[PDB]
Structures are given as structure tokens and as C-alpha cells.
Design a protein around this ligand. Structure first.
Ligand code: MG
Ligand code: MG
Ligand code: MG
Ligand code: MG
Ligand code: MG
Ligand code: MG
Ligand code: MG
Ligand code: MG
Ligand code: MG
Ligand code: MG
Ligand code: MG
Ligand code: MG
Ligand code: MG
Ligand code: MG
Ligand code: MG
Ligand code: MG
Ligand code: MG
Ligand code: MG
Ligand code: MG
Ligand code: MG
Ligand code: MG
Ligand code: MG
Ligand code: MG
Ligand code: MG
Ligand code: MG
Length: 206
RNA sequence: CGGUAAUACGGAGGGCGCGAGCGUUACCCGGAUUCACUGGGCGUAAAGGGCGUGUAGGCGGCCUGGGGCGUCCCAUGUGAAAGACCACGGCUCAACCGUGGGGGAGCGUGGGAUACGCUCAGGCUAGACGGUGGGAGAGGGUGGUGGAAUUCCCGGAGUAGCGGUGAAAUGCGCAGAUACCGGGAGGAACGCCGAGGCGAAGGCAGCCACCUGGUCCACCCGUGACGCUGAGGCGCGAAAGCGUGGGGAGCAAACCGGAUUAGAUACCCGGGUAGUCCACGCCCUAAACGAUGCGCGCUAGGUCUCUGGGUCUCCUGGGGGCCGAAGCUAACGCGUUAAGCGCGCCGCCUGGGGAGUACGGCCGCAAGGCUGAAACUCAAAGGAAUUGACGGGGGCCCGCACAAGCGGUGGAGCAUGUGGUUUAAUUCGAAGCAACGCGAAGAACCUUACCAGGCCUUGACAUGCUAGGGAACCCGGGUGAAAGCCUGGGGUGCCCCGCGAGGGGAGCCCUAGCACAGGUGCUGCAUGGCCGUCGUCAGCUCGUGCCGUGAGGUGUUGGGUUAAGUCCCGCAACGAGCGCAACCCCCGCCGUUAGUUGCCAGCGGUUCGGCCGGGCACUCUAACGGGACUGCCCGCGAAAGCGGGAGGAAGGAGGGGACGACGUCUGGUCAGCAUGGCCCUUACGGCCUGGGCGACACACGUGCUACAAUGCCCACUACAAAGCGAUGCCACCCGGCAACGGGGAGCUAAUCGCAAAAAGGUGGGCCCAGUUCGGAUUGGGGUCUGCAACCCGACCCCUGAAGCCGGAAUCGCUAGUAAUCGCGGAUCAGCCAUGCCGCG
RNA sequence: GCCCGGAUAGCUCAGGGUAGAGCAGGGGAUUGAAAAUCCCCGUGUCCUUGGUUCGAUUCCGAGUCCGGGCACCA
RNA sequence: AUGUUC
């Protein structure tokens, strides 16, 4: 029981909110709830698209949602039919009118959430974990990270004895607060239960 | 292997291997260099005999000759056939068979060779012995005799204790001890010298004499291989022990007493018999050890030391040590004093246990010794080194760890969590630290997981399919504690055939049917996620190099320094990473920006409160900056750093946060959530009313209030900070002793409100008392929240418990800390909050 | 008879204002647990009688029952 | 001085 959330630890400094609206005591409750049914819906529908973030701004009580995906192709559709329904789905579940923008994650191999998702997906499909891990870290570093770490939880290869295979390269100065360590976490659901996957990508300083 | 995902069980499919076969068991060889001739070993793994002496035996320097036994050569005989091997052939092949061919050690016979081994003969002098001359020595034996000490006896002198331990007592002592002195006895051992020396081993220590063994050196004088080893045999063999005698001071198994202890048949104390001593005779063992058989040769050196010799600053011999060449070694280590390189000879080993046991035999007075198995059993036993961890090991070093302090807990009441008991239920989890005011940041119903009873089933919730009706919605009627069951009505916007009949229609809702939902049911060793914890401890690693057969090591052992693997110095390492620190927030000094709702210094006015003008200066607010870095000075130091000083609001990490390395704990959580697997399906799901989680003979944790005078009560008067609030904070009136109730402004809040801060200060009262201390308990009468306060709420208003500072123990804190005093918040209708998180 | 002493909790024993250790039970405390160890409980006609005293288990005098020693018993 | 166990 230790190591605090490398995002939570940064926030004001180095790394920004995933939702930036204001609301007073009477309001926050309901907009936060929305935010959440929003993220939740997009979290499962845009799985194939490899989504890293779901940033949510909110102004004249109107809602813009930026979805930072690796595969905008997938969220869009051929000529944008899929993103049609997506804009209508959100509107169905929120009593409101919601801008849904896409944004290509330029390099998906520096997106901790994606790197993490990829390894998780690999595991879900009976891939060797140690290798999967080690490779993920090679990909991250090749893509110019100053350092990267990846951690698969336990029940690797299906064992009775749960474990925790880690693997890392470069600097990952978690105590350093100017660092800019993206962090990411996906599940592997398996016949044999869940393994969790943590990726840390270190990108630079100041 | 098998514990609920089993490539190891059983079956299936699939595969691999052989195939008229494939497996099994048994036995032999192999692997097994694990009986080692080829081809092993004995320092610590199993293995050097306890040491001499020596018999058989094994082995034997240099030269010359004779012999020709070994040995080698040639011929020749023999080595039957079959088999084996080569060729060619017969059965259609092959198996099987034929024919021919080459082998083959052995042994006989003849002839020959003579290097080596043997043998006979002669020779040599390098091995061995001897002569002469010198030497060192706890080598042995017998005799004596010297002083110190202990004990005892006789005295003297002197008196109250001595002795002894962790502490004591036993014991000795007034019948005179202990300490001191004189006289004497007797036994044992020899201080200093003293570390080395001698001996084959065991072992050997005052001095003197006699007897006696080994050994070294020199001259190079004599003999001339006379040598090495040595199964047996013979002798020697520590200590204990045995027999007969002696002797007996000190010591001291056993034993007796005293302690210690749970016991103490021990360790500590006081005594004490064998024995320890001597003679003679036995015993024959041992960690009898260098755990290393003896002899010889050969392979760098350095250094200390004993003892000889030397035209003596070094050489030369013999011993004893330490370090090391090459080499060996599993490693440790050994290394001209070999565990190296070699030859001779002896001894011994062959997994562990059983067991040095049994049986037998030999020896012994006995104790016992020697020789020495097997059954059965295990899958190891084991050596060395490595990384850890551990220590009632060491050094160095840290933390409120102790210590120094100050205040508490443990006692009392009560609050609260827990054990337990109880109950229909008292849901469930947390268990040393790191469970127990913990999950719970809010249990009357709800919560709520439990109990009772009454009710519901495609369901309180989801996705979707079939179908007559209904298709939104909304209202009452019975029966009920409520759920629910039964009921009767108001009444179709919408897509659309349409100008309508009438008729398609999608939401949506009920009925039945189908899939499915639901499960706080189990497993925290199936899990994720999150957390605790060691520990904010100073660590944990890596890349390449180098060291090691290797695990691994170095780096990161050392010296200094730091809060720190912080830094410095050093170094077969040079770097790096996760940690430390820094980057982030708060607090402390100042600046710039900004001037309302905040401030009010100087004005002017004034119903006093900055109220109005003005103004933002100061205070604030809050955003951005500056500022500290051992930077400067002195001293110490090689440096890092340290001591001190100055300036500065602030130093030596300025004070607090946030922050928790690789890992540990099969830690915690399936009951927050997620999740594999297991389980429930008119019930383990779901709804309700009521009860319970609040029970109380007990025990424990954390707290609160106290026991009072540095106090308590009443009046009056001050000085905060951080928060919170528009179905809420509530000013201010009024009524009420009061909780509160009626009114009722202001406040989307730097505006108005909660708000009184309390301790403090000033008055007064109490006068040491179970009290004007303390406020438990209990009776009544009220208030408020809420459908409802019986179990079970808080608050107000009129009994007055225990408790006179708390046993063994035990906690917190190092400075704006502890101690004490209040204030706010989350949860929340209300509150059992004395808790928690914060604020001053 | 005479002189001495004893009688205290269930047992074994300590002692002018006051009743105690010990053993056994039970709570605690210590330990990570368990033992060992430490602490706290509840227990009396203080033999009986009269005296002294404000107070007696304590001092006095008597008496009973024991123990020691000595008398002696019609 | 002593001071056991899992
Ligand atoms: Mg063999
Ligand atoms: Mg061998
Ligand atoms: Mg051994
Ligand atoms: Mg051995
Ligand atoms: Mg020997
Ligand atoms: Mg001979
Ligand atoms: Mg001769
Ligand atoms: Mg001569
Ligand atoms: Mg002997
Ligand atoms: Mg002897
Ligand atoms: Mg004798
Ligand atoms: Mg005897
Ligand atoms: Mg003794
Ligand atoms: Mg031996
Ligand atoms: Mg050496
Ligand atoms: Mg026998
Ligand atoms: Mg202390
Ligand atoms: Mg108490
Ligand atoms: Mg459970
Ligand atoms: Mg666990
Ligand atoms: Mg548990
Ligand atoms: Mg467990
Ligand atoms: Mg409770
Ligand atoms: Mg009292
Ligand atoms: Mg008093």
C-alpha cells in the first residue's frame, strides 16, 4: 500500500485535469454525474478506437467533449455515420446538446493509457506476458520517451499464485514533480480473472 | 504427480515409437573412472596405522666384464571341428548352410640379440655406516637438595569477626578464629629466566651429581651400496582406570551441606572420598592432530628465529615460524618443513544410518580393548565456499528507544469500540506492534447485510424475443401493520389510409410464455484495485570492465563528513538507475500588480464605531515575484565539512506539509468497487410492518468528566483563526426561568448570519468540608426533529452516586512541541460526537 | 497441686490503637504466544472469663485445653 | 549470577 497516483500527484503542476468546468455546491453534483455517464458510455463504445482521454469542458451550460483517440477512423465511420449516432447517443443520455470532437493522439506509443491497453489486450489473448511487457517498453523508448515502466499484476499465464511482472527502461522519477509521467491503467479480464496493467511513460522535465 | 483451470490419476480425441508383435517381471554386462591394469583416491568429503623397532616380502647408485633366467627377434610344432572375421558360392532373398582364406594369445623345440631387469665376478664413492674434533638441548633413568606458597600442629601477640556471592547462606570463630610473628611437620609443583628447545610418538621445565639415548656441524680420515620400506612379531604409548603396597599438603569425580530454579539430581558457595603423588605390575585408549605414513631426488625467493661452521658488511649446514614463484586444490588453502613434480614400500577408503553394535575369536583381574559383519532402513549423508537471516557475538552509528523532564493511562463515574456471555436476532468484517472512538465522515423506521411474522414472483433493476388485451398518464373503493391482493373510474397527444367510415402506428404501461435478471451466499492462499506495515529507515539495483570453475564479488569493504549510498578522500573500477535531495503547497521578511464587500494615516464633515466625503497609504485579501547560497569573516581540516562571528525577517535542511525505493508480511479488504471459481432460483432473490445490531455476571482498548483553592460559582469586561450557510445561516422584537415558539429584516454572502471564543482581566461569593469540589443516578414537568423517540434521540427546567490523585504495570511529547483553553467542519431530519479532520 | 510456655483465617504461621504474609481459587499485569515472574480481591468470637483503659488479640488477674519440668493422688 | 518453549 503505497505510491500515489502519478496524475493525482501532479494536477496543478506538470499535468492537467481531464474535466475543467466550474460549478457551485448546488450544481457540481449533477454535472459530475453527467461527466461520468458520459465517460462511461464513450469508454466502452470507443474501445476499438483506443481512447486515451475524454476531456470535458463546459461553458454556457453546454458541453464539449474531446475524445483523444488513436483511431479516429473508427469513431468517425465512412463519411461519419458512426460519430453521428455517437453524438445522438450522448444527447439521448444527457438531456442536452453535446459537442463530440475527435483528436488524434499523435504518438500512441507515448500514451500510457494506450500502451497499457495494448498490453492488456495482448494478455487477454493469451500472449506471453514477460515478452509483451518488455516489447511495450521497447516501443515506448523507440518513440523517444526519456523512460518507461510497465507492470502486469498477477495470475500471469493463468497461475494459482498471483504475481507481478514489472520491466522498465530509462528514468521514471516518480518523486520528481516537474517530471510529466503519463500513467495508464487497463484491465485484462480473463478466464482466470483479472490482471491489471500499469504503464508509466516519462516524457521530459519542466 | 494428485488440495477444483492436473500436458504426471481415469477416459476421449490427437500424437510418438515399434509392429505379428508390443509391454512387464527376473537375471547378466553396460552406463559405473562406483574396486580405477587400462583408469580413482585418504588435511577438512570415506580413507595415514598412536609412535618406534624390525621378520618375510617388495623395491635397489656409478663403471667394466662373464652368463643369457626375465625380455625382444626369427624359424618351427601346437593352438581340432563348429563359432567369430574376410571372400566367393547354395537355398528366389535373408536367416540357415557350403567351400576357401586370414588371423589368435598361450605353451614346446631350434636358432639369434644383450639395451633394460636378474645373476656371478671385479671396480668406484655421490647413498648408507664409521673415526677424530667440537656443539645445543625440559630427551631418558637413579640418587640427592633449594626456596616461594598452601595446609596442619605447638607457641606468641592481639580481638570480633573471618570466609564467601550476582546477592546470600552453609562453614569457621570468645574452647579466641581472620590478619601478624616465631617454631615445626608434611606433600605436591617448580615463579622470574620463558619465546624458544629435546624426543619416533606419547611427552619432557628448580638446582646438583652419576648413569644414558637421539641429534647437528667440521676435517674429508676409514668401510665400500652395507640401502629404502616393512604384512606379521617385539617394545613405547597422555589422562582416566585396575591390582598390591606406600604416601596424602593442595586439588577434587562420587557424596554431604548452602544457594539458584518451575524443578536444579547442574552451573555459583562451604566441605568431601576415591583419585591426582611414589614403587612395582596391569590397562593400550584419545580431537594419540599437522585430523597430512616413511625414505630419496627435483622445482623462485623474501623475512623472523634456534643451533653448528666459516679470509665473517655476507656465505654455508641442521632445525622452527610467517609470506609467497611455478604448480596443485572442490574450495579453504598447500607451496624447498608441499597438499607441487616424480620413484619405492607400507597402511587405509568405496553412500548414510544400523555400528565400532551383534556373533565368533584373541587379549585383559576388571573396566574394557582389538578383530568386525548382516537384516532392515533412508535418497541422501557429506566437504568447501556464496547470499542472507539470526545471536543472551564485536565495532561504529541512529530514532521520544532509554535517560532528563512535563503531563497522562491502569483506580472512580460515564462515553465508546472489543472479548465474552446472552438472545429469536443480538448481521458482517478488523486480532500484537500494524484489530479494539477501526470499515461506520451520523443504526429509532431508512440505513440493514440479522430475527420474527405478513407478502412478491420475469421479479426492485438490465438486454431482447412471442402474443389476445392494454397500449403514456392520473384518480379514488375495499381488505390489511404495511407491503400486497382485489377494485372502479377519469381517458389516447402520436406516425398515419383521410375531407371521413374506419384503419395502419411508434413510444409507453399492465397479463401470460420465453430467454434472463437478483444474491452484503463462499473463497482476500484463485484475483485486480486500493490500503496497512517494516520505514521517510538509507537503502535496492543496473550497464560495461575487472576477480572467481561457480553461486557470487567489486562498484556499494576503508578514512572522514551528513538528516541521507549527502558530500569528500581513497580504491579495479568508470558510469547509471529506483530511492535521498531538489522541482510542488503552507508558515515566516519584503517588493510589484489590484482598492470592494476589506483597511482608515493625514483631511472635511458626523445621528461615534469608517457613518459620508475623500484616499489605498498602512492592515488585509491574492496573484506574480524577490530573498539564504556556509555567499561573506575568523578558526580547525588534505577535502567534504565543522566551531564561531557578522550582516539579515529568516540560516547552516528557517518551521510545517505533500511525497514512501527493490521488496517484506501467503498482512488487510470478494461487505465500497471490480473480478476467476464455487454455490442459491415460489428463494440464499424481492417488498413490508415490528424487533435487533443499543442485550449485561463479567474482562480489555481508546476517550471524556473529575477528586478541587494555581480551584469552584456569579456578574461584568476583552483579544482569535479556520470553516459553514438562500427550503439554509438567521440579525432584531416579543412570550416564555428556559429549551424553544410566535413575528421578522439581512445574506446568491471579504456585504448578512451562525458568533458567545474560551482560558484571560476586573468585581464579588465559597473558606478546606465529600464541600458552592464532582455531576453519576433517579423522579417529575417542558421543548425540538420526525409518519413515529416503548425498546432507543437530543435539549431545557426543579435528586446529588463514586471519586481525597489511583497496584503490578503502562502511554504521549524535544518548542510554539507538551500541557491547557475554547472555535469550525464533514456525515447529518434529529443524534447518542466525550469520536474524527481542522482552526486558532 | 507448683513453675514455665502455647491457643490468631481452611491449614501453617507472623505480630495498647491497626489484624496480617504464605499456601489454594479468581481477576489483572509481562510475552507475538505459553510457562516462569509481578500485582489486587474475599477469609477471623485473635481460647474463655472478669479487670485496667477513652480504646485490649496486645497490659493485669483468674479459668479451660494443650506442651515442658518437678511434686502426688486419699 | 540464573531464566524454558513454539
Ligand atoms: Mg567397471
Ligand atoms: Mg573417488
Ligand atoms: Mg566430520
Ligand atoms: Mg575424514
Ligand atoms: Mg600419524
Ligand atoms: Mg630385506
Ligand atoms: Mg659389487
Ligand atoms: Mg675418503
Ligand atoms: Mg598408559
Ligand atoms: Mg595415571
Ligand atoms: Mg592405585
Ligand atoms: Mg572402581
Ligand atoms: Mg565445591
Ligand atoms: Mg585416525
Ligand atoms: Mg604459504
Ligand atoms: Mg564378544
Ligand atoms: Mg523517561
Ligand atoms: Mg478508568
Ligand atoms: Mg465475509
Ligand atoms: Mg492478501
Ligand atoms: Mg480475514
Ligand atoms: Mg491470509
Ligand atoms: Mg454497533
Ligand atoms: Mg466515598
Ligand atoms: Mg478535599
Amino acid at each position: 500500500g503505497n505510491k500515489i497516483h502519478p496524475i493525482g500527484f501532479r494536477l496543478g503542476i506538470t499535468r492537467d485535469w481531464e474535466s475543467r468546468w466550474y460549478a457551485g455546491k448546488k450544481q457540481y453534483r449533477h454535472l459530475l454525474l453527467e461527466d461520468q455517464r458520459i465517460r462511461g458510455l464513450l469508454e466502452k463504445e470507443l474501445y476499438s478506437a483506443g481512447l486515451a482521454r475524454v476531456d470535458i469542458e463546459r461553458a454556457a451550460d453546454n458541453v464539449a467533449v474531446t475524445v483523444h483517440v488513436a483511431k479516429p477512423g473508427v469513431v468517425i465511420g465512412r463519411g461519419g455515420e458512426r460519430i453521428r449516432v455517437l453524438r445522438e447517443e450522448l444527447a439521448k443520455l444527457t438531456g442536452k446538446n453535446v459537442a463530440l470532437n475527435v483528436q488524434e493522439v499523435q504518438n500512441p506509443n507515448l500514451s500510457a493509457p494506450l500502451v497499457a491497453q495494448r498490453v492488456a489486450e495482448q494478455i487477454e489473448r493469451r500472449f506471453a506476458v514477460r515478452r509483451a511487457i518488455k516489447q511495450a517498453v521497447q516501443r515506448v523508448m523507440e518513440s523517444g520517451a526519456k523512460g518507461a515502466k510497465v507492470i502486469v499484476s498477477g495470475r500471469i499465464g493463468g497461475a494459482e499464485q498471483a504475481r507481478t511482472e514489472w520491466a522498465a527502461q530509462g528514468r521514471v522519477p516518480l518523486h520528481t514533480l516537474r517530471a510529466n509521467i503519463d500513467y495508464g491503467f487497463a484491465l485484462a479480464r480473463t478466464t482466470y480473472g483479472v490482471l491489471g496493467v500499469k504503464a508509466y511513460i516519462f516524457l521530459g522535465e519542466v
